[PDB]
């Protein structure tokens, strides 16, 4: 997708401030909690019986770190998300068969996580920019369905 210089600036300034070791786990964690059916794809992760168990689960944070990495990777190739997400698309679509709607959900959960961490710094225009980005990643992750 195409972000304007202001949107790119609003996105990168805030991103640089992100704790890459925590925000991915927080978002994955919250997805598993807010949309329970998602846990179906993580039977090997252990205890997910409670939100506290989910959020403190080592596997979760570890896996969320990877997810964030892919998001960062995406922020670096805003103008080439299709190519960037190719193998993740085959993995998520052809192997896992994750319904795409869940890609949009995780993206929106990320946005919630960012709003929660950054407060008033996560302005409406800063959010609008971030919505274009998570929309882009979701679209790209789902290319193997198109």
């Amino acid at each position: 997708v195409h972000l304007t210089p202001e949107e790119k600036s609003a996105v990168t300034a805030l991103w640089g401030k992100v704790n890459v070791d925590e925000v991915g786990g927080e978002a994955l964690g919250r997805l598993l909690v807010v949309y329970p059916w998602t846990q179906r794809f993580f039977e090997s992760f252990g205890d997910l019986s409670t939100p506290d168990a989910v959020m403190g689960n080592p596997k979760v944070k570890a896996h969320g770190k990877k997810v964030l990495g892919a998001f960062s990777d995406g922020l670096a190739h805003l103008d080439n998300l299709k190519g960037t997400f190719a193998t993740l698309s085959e993995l998520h679509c052809d192997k896992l068969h994750v319904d795409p709607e869940n890609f949009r959900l995780l993206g929106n959960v990320l946005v919630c996580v960012l709003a929660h961490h950054f407060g008033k710094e996560f302005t409406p225009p800063v959010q609008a920019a971030y919505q274009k980005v998570v929309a882009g990643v979701a679209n790209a992750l789902a290319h193997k369905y198109h």
Binding site: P51, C112, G119, F122, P124, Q131
Partner: protein
């Protein structure tokens, strides 16, 4: 179906928001207008610029209908009947837009309630907004 804990969680959140409810409602609407431009077509006659008294005025109405929903959580269908009539019948509001505003409402709470917006509360708030939205799109005939 909202669980008793969800009710307790949503109650607490509203509690904390306090007198900011009106103001947070305007911010959610602005967040929606900027993030999901397609939603702007329902407000052709509104000035949607930042600081718009019409937007602030509307966020108050939105926040109030949500407070009424909360104050009457076990019968939102009844409490929200006139509103759902208005949204489906007269306004023809595409159901998908309810998910867009609900998300923006979540984002607004998250941006203002650091200690409150826990995973669990986020889950409860999410379910409450989906219930309100179900009711609001219920009169589609």
């Amino acid at each position: 179906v909202l669980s008793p804990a969800d009710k307790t969680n949503v109650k607490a959140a509203w509690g904390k928001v306090g007198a900011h409810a009106g103001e947070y409602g305007a911010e959610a609407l602005e967040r929606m207008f900027l993030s999901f431009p397609t939603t702007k077509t329902y407000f052709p006659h509104f000035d949607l610029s930042h600081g718009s008294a019409q937007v602030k005025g509307h966020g108050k109405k939105v926040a109030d209908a949500l407070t009424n929903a909360v104050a009457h959580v076990d019968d939102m269908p009844n409490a929200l009947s006139a509103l759902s009539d208005l949204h489906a019948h007269k306004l023809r509001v595409d159901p998908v837009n309810f998910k867009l505003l609900s998300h923006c409402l979540l984002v607004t709470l998250a941006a203002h309630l650091p200690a409150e917006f826990t995973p669990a509360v986020h889950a409860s708030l999410d379910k409450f907004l989906a219930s309100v939205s179900t009711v609001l799109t219920s009169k589609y005939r």
